[PDB]
Amino acid sequence: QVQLQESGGGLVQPGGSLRLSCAASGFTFSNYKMNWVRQAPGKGLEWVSDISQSGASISYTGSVKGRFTISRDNAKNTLYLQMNSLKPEDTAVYYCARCPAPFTRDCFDVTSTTYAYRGQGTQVTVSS
Amino acid sequence: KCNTATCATQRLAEFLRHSSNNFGPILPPTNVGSNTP
Amino acid sequence: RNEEKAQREANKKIEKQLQKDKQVYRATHRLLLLGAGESGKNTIVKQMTSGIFETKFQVDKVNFHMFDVGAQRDERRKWIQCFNDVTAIIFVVASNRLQAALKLFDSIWNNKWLRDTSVILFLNKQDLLAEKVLAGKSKIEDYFPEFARYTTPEDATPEPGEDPRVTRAKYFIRDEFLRISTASGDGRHYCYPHFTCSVDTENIRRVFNDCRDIIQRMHLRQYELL
Amino acid sequence: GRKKMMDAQYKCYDRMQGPYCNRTWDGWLCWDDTPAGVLSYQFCPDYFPDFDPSEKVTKYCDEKGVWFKHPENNRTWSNYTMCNAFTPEKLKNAYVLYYLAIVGHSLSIFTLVISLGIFVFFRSLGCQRVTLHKNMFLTYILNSMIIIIHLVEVVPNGELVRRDPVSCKILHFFHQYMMACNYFWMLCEGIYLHTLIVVAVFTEKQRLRWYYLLGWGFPLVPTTIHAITRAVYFNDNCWLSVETHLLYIIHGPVMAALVVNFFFLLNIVRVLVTKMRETHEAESHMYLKAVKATMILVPLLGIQFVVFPWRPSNKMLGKIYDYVMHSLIHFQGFFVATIYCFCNNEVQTTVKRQWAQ
Amino acid sequence: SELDQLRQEAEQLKNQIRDARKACADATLSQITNNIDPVGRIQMRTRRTLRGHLAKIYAMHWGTDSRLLVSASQDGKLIIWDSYTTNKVHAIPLRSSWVMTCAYAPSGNYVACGGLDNICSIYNLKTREGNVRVSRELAGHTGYLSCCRFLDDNQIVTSSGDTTCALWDIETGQQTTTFTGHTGDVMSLSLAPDTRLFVSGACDASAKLWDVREGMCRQTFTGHESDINAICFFPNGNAFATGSDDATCRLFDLRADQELMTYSHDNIICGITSVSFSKSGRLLLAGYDDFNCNVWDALKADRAGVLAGHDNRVSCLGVTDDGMAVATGSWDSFLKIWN
Amino acid sequence: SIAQARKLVEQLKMEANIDRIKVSKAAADLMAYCEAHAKEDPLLTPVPASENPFR
């Protein structure tokens, strides 16, 4: 069973920092590409960042290009997302998405409304 | 005389047929000295 | 053995139908219309249930077969492998919807079955982008921080009456797709950028000219010339 | 040789029907009127085996109105040393060229039969181009085998040509027909290449019947016409003489087809250069790719017969031209079979896949 | 909240299911068949090659009598071959050229096809006019048709991309039963020999066993890492094998309700497209994206042979009812019979 | 959704009520089936050319 359990998040003052962890089980975490997706209320899913199998290729979206940090631990089968210099616009539920196929450069259906390989994310609220 | 590039093989064959004694012994060259016209 | 003789005659008759049907199949250039959501791909077909839609048109006595996918869910990773032998894939982008379109182009570009299938890129809604840039209500810097240090390339040919602000913005979006295109696909397939509107009649001519480049390159590849 | 000279003497006797040099008969050639102060030129006769017909004969008539006199005997003498000055060297060069031609034709036959077997064994490679390539290989083999047969069983055998049978006449007719078929299939391949990329590139499903008719049926007409004229006008022993101008009936259309092929090659190279320039390629890489394309397309279209159609008169320059032209012509089949069968990506991939079992 | 309590409660049920599954795992299949004799090195050669299809092949189905078989290609044509003499019997044009599946009725009087048009069309092969014409067009699916199997001349089970399976009754055009519960697109389905139940593979790396008459899911099998592309019931009807994109094949037992043995290799990276069993079930033939077909010893997981005759990826394969030969379909527009 | 999550709870309840046997006993049946039908598999045991229609 492909299971991805998220952790972290909660209420944080504006300008604070947060750390999200994505526990991985039921699959070999070393050879799969992981993506970060978020869904703020009143709108659909959006892509945040991704990390390659070995971590050589790292890319972020435009909004968190200079603020968010993506890191993975293949040995511990966990995925980290270091959030720094938060803003109230960043409040959303963050899910860690797994690539549909191993050893595949492309990664389809990551931001689809229904995704089998997506866990129950943790609500993140940034307000004063 | 045909001098085109497609004529090279035939020209070589004719030269071999005429100037060579059937790929055998070589005859002495024809005299071109003073006594000859 | 009379039944066997009839079977051979029946098989022979079928082969004649297959031979005639073979000419028609190679006479049509199949195309896949894969415009993203709210990208104006419906307007292109209209100006020239059911799970698929077919639209046949002829340009310069060349048969074209365009296919638009409707009534199929957002999971495109399974039914897109069927379109691995089409002449080209028409990608319509509405110019964070833009970020989603770039991550669908990148995964089409890098797919194992689509690495030889060329993609025609249509930068739609050019008129809508022109007024948004002039108004200034929406900032491209917030959605794309790299726009601050981006400069207009020397190969640009802006249309008359176009301010430098919109020209830099529209070419910046096009260059983002080119970064993915020029990162993989070592000669197997090419991407053709196009700045198109939703009412222009030259879209069919652009596709016809684009297909000419694809077939010409394919013929050169068979002869090991390109 | 001796009999031919008597006919020339009889023909010279039937001719002629400040001071000037009178027309006379020296013993080998007959000369017309010659003014004072000129060096008359004409081709050397072929009466003697050691005499080179292509060479010239020089003779000086002084201002005084008398012929040149040899100091040894003070007698009318003609400079015939120029005809045979370089004959042994030319004979050695011809021997080397003949050996090289035999080796190249044998290698071409071997490589082309291997390529044909490979092409017909695997039907996965089968395509419209592959059929024309197979016809190319078949006519190449048929021409090379006939050339080898003519060079081995006819040229060294003087008894057969002296007897002058009709079998050798039919063999020469078939040789000319096969040569024309090869040089016209070259044009067919060039036309197909032009039709694929240059013009009519959209869903080009061309009917091949015209290609078969032009490559195989069309050359039969000029060859038959030339045979008729030779049997009517210039009938001789075994029809192997190349001095006659009737060979141009077959050769001229071949040269025109090769010139059209050269034009098609230029157009295709220009199209490829434009395509490479449309993608912002490096100048050095573009030039290298264009050079490679031209080098690999020269053997297929028979460009070597048009780029160098002249024989330099210089001994060294003509020597280099001979050992370049013979090497190019007699090894063209091997080059074509290596480039378009052994160097093909699809053929190599299929061979590697089949090598597993 | 109520939503959180259900998720917390669901974990308890999943943990209980894992507890029950772990208790039944007293000895895996490896030790049970460790002392059996090896299957040996088996060989197959291409006996026939069916040519005539213009485009890539996506599905094929052997007939009940094991001589006439149908093949579905993406050029818009259905061809019924005579594998004994290689002669073509029927060439049925298709309204939509984007079909992805085909089936052969047990009686042989009807054939079916479907694909991106979301419509299953049944063609009558025994028409009084000789020409083959459509008989019933089944509509109602909101996704691409991936598989279809016949129960009888008046019943057919189809799977679609809308994560649902349906049972259809001919001559009315209305689906009688709908199977729901899958979250990913259903890619393949296989019918048990007893016909009472059937299993289907979806894109959620899970397999669900359905009761045809009741319309309810009995058991759910998990363990795969990626989308399942193929499924095939064991000849005895008590088990099945699944092919997935994770380059691994797994065997699931209905009574054990857990995976029995996984077939994997270091050199295999590509996924599996088609899965089928032999007559006795000892051998397992699975297609691969690397243009090869590998035969797996189901009892020992050791590789038995490799079928390397296709220039393109194998999209479909099947074994006749008597098990006399196996035919594999590939995207190279050629169908080859291996024996 | 509340309704969507509730239906998953009921479905898991049915799967937890079924009866399961030991793997060793279950796997023995598959082994026995192959042994009994081993002689009836043309793909397993080579078939003679005369008997094979695909010769």
D229 and D309 housed in the same domain: yes
C-alpha E30/C-alpha E41 separation (Å) is 20
Beta strands E197-201; E206-211: pairing state: antiparallel
* Residues D225 and D250 sit within 8 Å (Cβ to Cβ): no
* Residues D156 and B23 sit within 8 Å (Cβ to Cβ): yes
Domains of chain F, residue spans: 2-54
> DSSP for E308-333?
---SS-EEEEEE-TT-S-EEEEETTS
Q: Which residues of C touch D274 (CB under 8 A)?
A: none
* Amino acid identity for residue C208 in this structure: F
Q: Token pair for residue D205?
A: 């499903």
**Contacts for E96 with CB less than 8 Å, ≥ 6 apart:** C52, E76, E115, E116, E117, E119
**Given E82, E98, E141, which is nearest C7 (Cβ)?**
E82
Q: Which residues of E touch A53 (CB under 8 A)?
A: none
SS3 A32: coil
**D323 lies in which domain range?**
87-354
- Angle (nearest 5°) at CA A122 between A120 and A127: 150
Backbone angles phi, psi at D200, to 5 degrees: 60, 60
Which residue pairs from D210-217 have beta carbons closer than 8 angstroms and sit at least 24 positions apart in sequence?
D211/D132, D212/D135, D214/D184, D214/D187, D214/D188, D215/D135, D215/D139, D215/D181, D215/D184, D215/D185, D215/D188, D216/D135, D216/D181, D216/D185
Beta strands C119-124; C88-94: pairing state: parallel
Chain F within 8 Å of E239 (Cβ-Cβ)? yes
**Given D124, D350, D357, which is nearest E308 (Cβ)?**
D357
C-alpha F53/C-alpha F50 separation (Å) is 7
- Select from D57, D84, D111 the last residue of a domain: D84
**E54 lies in which domain range?**
2-339
* Residues E311 and E24 sit within 8 Å (Cβ to Cβ): no
> Is D353–E308 a contact, with Cβ atoms under 8 angstroms apart?
yes
Backbone angles phi, psi at A78, to 5 degrees: -135, 155
CATH topology of domain F2-54: G Protein Gi Gamma 2 (4.10.260)
Q: Token pair for residue F26?
A: 């279950």
Instruction: Return the H-helix or E-strand segment holding A128.
Output: none
D327 and D249 housed in the same domain: yes
* Amino acid identity for residue F18 in this structure: I
> Is C96–A61 a contact, with Cβ atoms under 8 angstroms apart?
yes
C-alpha C64/C-alpha C69 separation (Å) is 17
C-alpha neighbours within 13 Å on the C-beta side of residue E233: 21
* Amino acid identity for residue D336 in this structure: V
* Nearest CA among E174, E53, E166, E154 for reference residue E109: E154
Chain F within 8 Å of E41 (Cβ-Cβ)? no
CATH number of the CATH domain containing D47: 4.10.1240.10
Resolution (A): 3.2
Domain count, chain E: 1
Domains in chain A: ranges and CATH: 1-128 (2.60.40.10)
* Distance from the C225 Cα atom to the nearest Cα atom in chain D, whole angstroms: 6
**Contacts for A104 with CB less than 8 Å, ≥ 6 apart:** A33, C112
* Distance from the E332 Cα atom to the nearest Cα atom in chain D, whole angstroms: 9
SS3 A95: strand
Beta strands E258-263; E249-253: pairing state: antiparallel
* Distance from the F53 Cα atom to the nearest Cα atom in chain E, whole angstroms: 6
* Residues A45 and A51 sit within 8 Å (Cβ to Cβ): no
D202 and D77 housed in the same domain: no
C-alpha E123/C-alpha E94 separation (Å) is 10
* Nearest CA among E320, E289, E321, E283 for reference residue E302: E283
Q: Token pair for residue D333?
A: 């089949």
Q: Token pair for residue E139?
A: 């509509």
| Technique of determination | cryo-EM
CATH number of the CATH domain containing C214: 3.40.50.300
CATH number of the CATH domain containing E68: 2.130.10.10
* Nearest CA among D287, D296, D291, D276 for reference residue C213: D276
Domain count, chain C: 1
**Contacts for D122 with CB less than 8 Å, ≥ 6 apart:** D347, D350, D354
D150 and D7 housed in the same domain: no
D and F make contact (3+ CB pairs below 8 Å)? no
* Residues E190 and A65 sit within 8 Å (Cβ to Cβ): no
> Is E332–D350 a contact, with Cβ atoms under 8 angstroms apart?
no
Chain C within 8 Å of D197 (Cβ-Cβ)? yes
SS3 E102: strand
A and C make contact (3+ CB pairs below 8 Å)? yes
The answer to the question of residue C96 being in a domain is yes
C-alpha D79/C-alpha C4 separation (Å) is 87
CA F20 to chain CA mean position, Å: 15
* Residues E98 and E59 sit within 8 Å (Cβ to Cβ): no
CATH number of the CATH domain containing D299: 1.20.1070.10
Residue indicated by tokens 């070592």: C186
D67 and D109 housed in the same domain: no
* Amino acid identity for residue C3 in this structure: E
Which residue pairs from D306-312 have beta carbons closer than 8 angstroms and sit at least 24 positions apart in sequence?
D306/B5, D306/D255, D306/D258, D306/D259, D306/D261, D306/D262, D307/D262, D308/B5, D309/B4, D309/B5, D309/D255, D311/B3
> Is B22–D248 a contact, with Cβ atoms under 8 angstroms apart?
no
D193 and D68 housed in the same domain: no
> Is E311–D350 a contact, with Cβ atoms under 8 angstroms apart?
yes
D105 and D62 housed in the same domain: no
**Given E142, E203, E227, which is nearest C71 (Cβ)?**
E142
Query: Where does residue F29 rank: exposed (0-12), middle (13-18), buried (19+ CB within 10 A)?
Result: middle
D171 and D280 housed in the same domain: yes
D111 and D135 housed in the same domain: yes
**C146 lies in which domain range?**
32-48+79-222
Backbone angles phi, psi at C31, to 5 degrees: -130, 145
DSSP 8-state symbol, E125: S
D315-330 helix and B8-19 helix, angle to the nearest 10 degrees: 110
Cβ atoms within 10 A of the Cβ of C124, count? Answer: 26
C-alpha A120/C-alpha E6 separation (Å) is 13
The answer to the question of residue C13 being in a domain is no
Backbone angles phi, psi at E49, to 5 degrees: -135, 110
**Given C8, C22, C51, which is nearest E87 (Cβ)?**
C8
Q: Token pair for residue E140?
A: 């109602």
- Select from D31, D60, D84 the last residue of a domain: D84
CA E209 to chain CA mean position, Å: 14
Q: Token pair for residue E149?
A: 């199997």
